[PDB]
From a paper:
Olfaction, or the sense of smell, is initiated by the stimulation of odorant receptors (ORs) by odorants. Here, we determined the cryo-electron microscopy structures of consensus [name] (OR52cs), a representative of the [name] family, in the ligand-free (apo) and octanoate-bound states. Several subtypes of the human [name] family, including OR52A5, OR52B2, OR52E1, OR52E8, and OR52L1, are known to recognize carboxylic acids, and the consensus [name] (OR52cs), representing 26 members of the human [name] family, is also responsive to carboxylic acid odorants.
Among the various lengths of carboxylic acid odorants tested (ranging from hexanoate to dodecanoate), [name], which showed the lowest EC50 value, was selected for our structural study. Finally, we purified the complex of full-length OR52cs, Gs, and Nb35 (the complex-stabilizing nanobody) in the presence of [name], and solved the cryo-EM structure of the [name]–OR52cs–Gs–Nb35 complex at a global resolution of 2.97 Å. After local refinement of the receptor, a 3.09 Å resolution receptor-focused map was obtained, in which most residues of OR52cs were well resolved and a clear density of [name] was identified within the transmembrane pocket. Similar to other previously reported GPCR–Gs structures, the C-terminus α5 helix of Gαs is inserted into the cytoplasmic cavity of OR52cs. The OR-conserved VAIC sequences, DRY motif, and several residues in the intracellular loop (ICL) regions (E5912.52, R13334.52, Y13434.53, and S232ICL3) are involved in interactions with Gαs. The odorant-binding pocket in OR52cs is formed by TMs 3, 4, 5, and 6 and distantly from TMs 1, 2, and 7, unlike the orthosteric ligand-binding pockets of most class A GPCRs. The carboxyl group of [name] forms electrostatic interactions with R2656.59 and H18345.52 of OR52cs. The importance of R2656.59 for [name] binding was demonstrated by the complete loss of downstream signaling in the R2656.59A mutant. In particular, F2616.55 forms an extensive hydrophobic interaction network with multiple carbon atoms of [name], and H1073.33 forms van der Waals contacts with the C3 and C5 carbons of [name]. Notably, TM6 underwent substantial conformational changes, with an inward movement at the extracellular end (7.4 Å shift of Cα6.59 atom) and an outward movement at the intracellular end (9.0 Å shift of Cα6.34 atom) upon [name] binding, acting Y2546.48 of the conserved FYxP motif as the pivot.
Residue numbers in the entry:
A (entry chain A): 13 to 47, 193 to 234, 251 to 277, 324 to 350, 355 to 380
B (entry chain N): 2 to 9, 13 to 126
C (entry chain R): 8 to 310
D (entry chain G): 10 to 61
E (entry chain B): 9 to 128, 133 to 340
The structure:
């Protein structure tokens, strides 16, 4: 009798604490720098998280599935290798619906957009950039991505 | 999984063959890669499960042709009008997972599904 | 002050010889409304991937429609079928109170849905930190409290008028002015207060809804892509059609009961029963079946 | 260095004194048969004695 | 040259020692029947996808790990929670339960193994030294642990000193899982080079190598008597091997299964083998005769982890929709 009361009281505090972390988890946006370290920052009262993986081997087919719920992938650009990796990521099953933010003139951009617009059925796009401006650019693309997701949700697109 | 590669004056012609054993050859996407002396591994050509979709790098587009034979589980690369800038060791790589459109680590070092290679000097 | 025992509802005035032919479509539409909303509520509750603010607002709308449709149609069907016209004095007041309060609640729910859509589309990166559970609870409480507090004086206003003479009221259900017009005294206070309440609720909600839709469609048309220019129109048109079909007959009845007497009565009674029946049947089809994540989850359960 | 290690490992693994397969299958069959009376997922336990 | 000759000799010996199959000898046993199992409990407290789970010695408590950065200790009898531990790194892909029941371990993309103490929850140790991400870890005792990493190595640690006692090397791909024998004298391992290896804990050298799959190997577990093991791979098949015979005996597959296998486990008597797949549900196989006998299908995303109690009374499955389900 007393043991069950203690157990229920113990579980209630766990539930109350867990309900607090959900609001923090849904209010932050995650990123992935693909040229583990974590960097957190804030822009316009919006929380942003970025991770960099450089302590692993060059065999990505097993640890890349851990990043299937990220908002976007930051690809830093040898050109053929970049295009081949972009094609490999674009056609994956778990990272299928993932946008890519390119950080590289018009010939290379057109070659990338040729593979970007080949498939996808209007589920993901590509945002090439030619390079405190980078953070603003990433912020704008993230806002556009989330707006398009909301549009798809409400049957307006 | 075993992959054995055989075969190999500017402007000439050459042909490489590769035979595969230990796995079902039909349901895998295959490709030819090269390693030049002084540089790293590079991707050359690709071929799908039935040979419907074919892809070449821009350097050798038009000159070379890649084919596949599922009845004898072997694939071929035919090169015409070869230039001295094409001397390298040729490997035959295989995509890691069946029934997939993605092939990640074929150009990585210490790949497990790749042959021994044959040297071509022009 | 001499209130009668009970009243008599006659139904459609001047069409008493075809009371059964008119009732054929009413049964079918009420039956469809009685099934769609229940199915939508069950699907929303049982699933755990449908727990978002949009679906909570949809659930509140479905419950409001289910309550609105169930206080009018059974009595109309009884009148049309078995000629059961007798109604007590207090059942009239309670029926009128519930009808008006839940009309106000439906308007508030629609306003909340419009606000949610506006914030979602026009403020994407702040959507999760603006609309939380506390805000949703406060919004629902505000809607219910506003409706209840605004409509509650009506029974007190109708209980002080002396009723001398007849008790027949030419309608299908008990309204505020339909009952008030049989009183033996001046009803200026009822006129002014009811007109003020209706203007303060319905018009204020309609203006904000129109502003939100205009802002949303203006933001959609600014996108470089042009495949959203047609689907947005194709959905907003159906939404606006249903909204108008709900809102217009309400104004028609509220204004004809006190400013128009030259209009024939049977069409007035027929139009007074449309805003109370049609949106309850047409809401789930345009909101639940047409949406992407509810149709495929309904067909997933039965198959 | 790698080839020598591979050859040494292959030489080490070439002598383990293996046995037949028909004799190594009857062992597992008998193991399953002898313990099949106390496996709850094979023989459903009475509901009263079931913790869940 | 020498390697090819040795391989040919080993192949000829393997052909010579084999005379009968596991199917021909088990052609007269009565079939198990239709295994019908239903969900008895549902545990829902995580926010992101679950990656690993481990049962307890008393068959009443278990620990779960998720990609949001949490460790949760459950009570499957009453569904009540016990402990919730936040983690320093959000990318965790393994967890373990000490046999005594007063320790837990976890690790992931940080190339570190962390051990927490429950009877104080504060961290106890942080073992470092690997070069790649950790894939599995199993307790042997309150002071010994075995891990496998993504740098193609396995390790045996000493918690009291915090140092690496032994290093097992020889694989040419990422090591995905390990399974410890009941005798605790040896264990088995599988990697992405499509091979499995048997390691002796005392001496520290590879004794046997098994090569029958065509792609990466994802899960592994020991048979109850310790004389065999099963493993699932990325080619949509399972295979059972033997130690005294040193060759594969049975394969489990179907013509309509395309997805790979993520988890594998055995029953109490070894008659049933449970396999979690990438197409949202898991299957039950009869070990003696390869024949499907049941399907557990309740999850909306891919099944990632699977476990069976020490008393054999219930099974627990985790998934990528952040739910743990107990079936019996
Ligand atoms: C939002 C509607 C509130 C009730 C309207 C009253 C109409 C009347 O007095 O005739």
């Amino acid at each position: 009798r007393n043991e069950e009361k203690a157990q229920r009281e113990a579980n209630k505090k766990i539930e109350k604490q867990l309900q607090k972390d959900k609001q923090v988890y849904r209010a932050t946006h995650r990123l992935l720098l693909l040229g583990i370290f974590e960097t957190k920052f804030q822009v316009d009262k919006v929380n942003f998280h970025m991770f960099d993986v450089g302590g692993q081997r060059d065999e990505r087919r097993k640890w890349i599935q851990c990043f299937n719920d990220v908002t976007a992938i930051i690809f830093v650009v040898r050109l053929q290798e970049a295009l081949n990796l972009f094609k490999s990521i674009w056609n994956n099953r778990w990272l299928r619906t993932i946008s890519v933010i390119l950080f590289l003139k018009y010939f290379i951009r057109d070659e990338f957009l040729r593979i970007s617009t080949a498939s996808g059925d209007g589920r993901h796009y590509c945002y090439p950039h030619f390079t405190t401006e980078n953070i603003r650019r990433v912020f704008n693309d993230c806002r556009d991505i989330i707006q398009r997701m909301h549009l798809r949700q409400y049957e307006l697109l | 999984v075993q992959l054995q590669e055989s075969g190999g004056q500017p402007g000439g012609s050459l042909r490489l063959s590769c035979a595969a054993s230990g796995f079902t050859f039909s349901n895998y996407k295959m490709n030819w890669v090269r390693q030049a002396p002084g540089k790293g591994l590079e991707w050359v050509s690709d071929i799908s499960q039935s040979g419907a979709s074919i892809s070449y790098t821009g350097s050798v587009k038009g000159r070379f042709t890649i084919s596949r034979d599922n009845a004898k589980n072997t694939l071929y690369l035919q090169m015409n009008s070869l230039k001295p800038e094409d001397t390298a060791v040729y490997y035959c790589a295989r995509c890691p997972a069946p029934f997939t459109r993605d092939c990640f680590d074929v150009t990585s070092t210490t790949y497990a599904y790749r042959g021994q290679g044959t040297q071509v000097t022009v | 002050s001499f209130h009668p025992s009970s009243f008599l509802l006659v139904g459609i005035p001047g069409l008493e010889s075809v009371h059964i032919w008119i009732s054929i479509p009413f049964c079918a539409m009420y039956l469809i409304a009685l099934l769609g909303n229940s199915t939508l509520l069950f699907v929303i509750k049982t699933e755990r991937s449908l727990h978002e603010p949009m679906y909570y607002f949809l659930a509140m709308l479905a419950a409001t429609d289910l309550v609105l449709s169930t206080s009018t149609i059974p009595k109309m069907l009884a009148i049309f079928w078995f000629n059961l016209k007798e109604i007590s004095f207090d059942a009239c007041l309670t029926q009128m109170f519930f009808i008006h309060s839940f009309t106000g609640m439906e308007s508030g729910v629609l306003l909340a849905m419009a606000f949610d859509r506006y914030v979602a589309i026009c403020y994407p990166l702040r959507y999760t930190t603006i609309l939380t559970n506390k805000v949703i609870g406060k919004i629902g409480m505000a809607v219910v409290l506003r409706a209840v507090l605004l409509v509650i004086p009506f029974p007190f206003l109708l209980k002080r008028l002396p009723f001398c003479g007849t008790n027949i009221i030419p309608h299908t259900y008990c309204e505020h002015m339909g009952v008030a017009k049989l009183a033996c005294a001046d009803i200026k206070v009822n006129i002014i207060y009811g007109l003020f309440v209706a203007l303060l609720i319905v018009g204020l909600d309609v203006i904000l809804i129109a502003l939100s839709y205009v802002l949303i469609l203006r933001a959609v048309f600014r996108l470089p892509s042009q495949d959203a220019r047609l689907k947005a129109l194709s959905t907003c048109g159906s939404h606006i059609c249903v909204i108008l079909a709900f809102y217009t007959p309400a104004f028609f009845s509220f204004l004809t009961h006190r400013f128009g007497h030259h209009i024939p009565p049977y069409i007035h009674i027929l139009l007074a029963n449309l805003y109370l029946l049609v949106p309850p049947m047409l809401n789930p089809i345009i909101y639940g079946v047409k949406t992407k994540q509810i149709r495929e989850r309904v067909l997933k359960i039965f198959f | 260095a790698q080839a020598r290690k591979l050859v040494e490992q292959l030489k080490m693994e070439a002598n383990i004194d293996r046995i037949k397969v028909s004799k190594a299958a009857a062992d597992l069959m008998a193991y399953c048969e002898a313990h099949a009376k106390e496996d709850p997922l094979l023989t459903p336990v009475p509901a009263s004695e079931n913790p869940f | 040259q020498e390697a090819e000759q040795l391989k040919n000799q080993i192949r000829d010996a393997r052909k010579a020692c084999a005379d009968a199959t596991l199917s021909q000898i088990t052609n007269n046993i009565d079939p198990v029947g239709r295994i019908q199992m239903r969900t008895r409990r549902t545990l829902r407290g995580h926010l992101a996808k679950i990656y690993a789970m481990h049962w307890g010695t008393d068959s009443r408590l278990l620990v779960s790990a998720s990609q949001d950065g949490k460790l949760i200790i459950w009570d499957s009898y009453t569904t009540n929670k016990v402990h919730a531990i936040p983690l320093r790194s959000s990318w965790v892909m393994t967890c373990a339960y000490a046999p005594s029941g007063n320790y837990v371990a976890c690790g992931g993309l940080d190339n570190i193994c962390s051990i927490y103490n429950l009877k104080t929850v504060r961290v106890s140790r942080e073992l470092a030294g690997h070069t790649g991400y950790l894939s599995c870890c199993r307790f042997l005792d309150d002071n010994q642990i075995v891990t496998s990493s993504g740098d193609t190595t396995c390790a045996l640690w000493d918690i009291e000193t915090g140092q690496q006692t032994t290093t097992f090397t020889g694989h040419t791909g990422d090591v995905m899982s390990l399974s410890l024998a009941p005798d605790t004298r040896l264990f088995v391992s599988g990697a992405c080079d499509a091979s499995a290896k048997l390691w002796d804990v005392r001496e520290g050298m590879c004794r046997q190598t098994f090569t029958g799959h065509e792609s990466d190997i994802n899960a592994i577990c020991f048979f109850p008597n310790g004389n065999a093991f099963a493993t699932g791979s990325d080619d949509a098949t399972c295979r059972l091997f033997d130690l005294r015979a040193d060759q594969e005996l049975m394969t489990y597959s179907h013509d309509n299964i395309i997805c790979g296998i993520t988890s594998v486990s055995f029953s109490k008597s070894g008659r049933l083998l449970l396999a979690g797949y990438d197409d949202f549900n898991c299957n039950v196989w009869d070990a003696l005769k390869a024949d499907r006998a049941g399907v557990l299908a309740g999850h909306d995303n891919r099944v990632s982890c699977l476990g069976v109690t020490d008393d054999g009374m219930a099974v627990a499955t985790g998934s990528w929709d952040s739910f743990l389900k107990i079936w019996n």
